[PDB]
Structures are given as C-alpha cells and as structure tokens.
C-alpha cells in the first residue's frame, strides 16, 4: 500500500499499542520509493505536530525506525532545515511548544541530540540543536538510551 496508507496505520490515534508491522511496512516502502525519503519526512513532520499525543508519539517512534532502516537517503532529508524546522516548531513556545506535552518534546530533543552524534556528517542538524540550547530550550544535553551503533 501507499506511503500514507502505511503511516496512517502506524500512527493511528486509535491503536491500542504500537503496531510494528506497519512501522516496518512504512520503512520498507520508503526504501522502494524513488521519492520515498522526501515524501516520508513531510508526512512524518505533520503527524508529529498533531495535537493528539498518541499520534505524535507513534510518529516519533516511526521516525526513529526510519533512521535505522532507511539509510543515507533518508538521513539527507532529515538533515535539511526544511524538515528540521518542523521539529523546532514542536518544541518552541513561539509555535507549538506551549500546546505540546513534555513527553513529546523531550523525545524530540532526545532524537535531535542523538543525531548530532550519530550523523556528524549532517551539519545542519547540529546547528538546529545548538540554536535550541542557545535559546534556552535545551538547558543541558539530555541522557539517552544506550546504543553502541551511535558511533
């Protein structure tokens, strides 16, 4: 099925629990699609900025899965401000910030922080993260789950 089809099912607010079947289905689809990466980020950005917390949370988990399954061609898309700004808006009071839960915000910060280490190649991700700290959105670097593949 289509990219949106997979994601809609992988981020459905009604899901009683995460459905890794669809999460993986979404990733495999992107790896097949000529424009899967470009379409995928825009689709994910939107789901992540959703007022429904469970939808946004699931979207973040799907985003995490994509980074580990969709290789370099996905990383390049996530590494552009065009997508990065969408995440900033989620944690910045000037935008969605004051209407988004902490769980969602910290997850975003965690992922962003994680990427600055994992993707030293994507310089735009670092600038995005520093800008956050500089503006006081991120007081200190947060602790993160142990993953020895994060180089």
């Amino acid at each position: 099925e289509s990219l949106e089809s997979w994601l809609n099912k992988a981020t459905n607010p009604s899901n009683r629990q995460e459905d890794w079947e669809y999460i993986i289905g979404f990733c495999d689809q992107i790896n097949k699609e000529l424009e899967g990466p470009q379409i995928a980020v825009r689709l994910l950005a939107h789901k992540i900025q959703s007022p429904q917390e469970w939808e946004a949370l699931q979207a973040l988990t799907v985003l995490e899965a994509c980074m580990k399954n969709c290789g370099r061609r996905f990383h390049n898309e996530v590494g552009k401000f065009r997508f990065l700004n969408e995440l900033i808006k989620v944690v910045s009071p000037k935008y969605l910030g004051d209407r988004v839960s902490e769980k969602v915000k910290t997850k975003v910060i965690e992922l962003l922080y994680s990427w600055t280490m994992a993707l030293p190649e994507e310089a735009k991700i670092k600038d995005a993260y520093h800008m956050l700290k500089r503006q006081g959105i991120v007081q200190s670097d947060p602790p993160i789950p142990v993953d020895r593949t994060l180089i």
Partner: peptide, 8 residues
C-alpha cells in the same frame, strides 16, 4: 534548495 534555519 533548502530553507534557512527557523528563528524563534
């Protein structure tokens, strides 16, 4: 091709 870093 890309946008500029958003500013708060």
């Amino acid at each position: 091709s890309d946008e500029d870093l958003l500013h708060i």
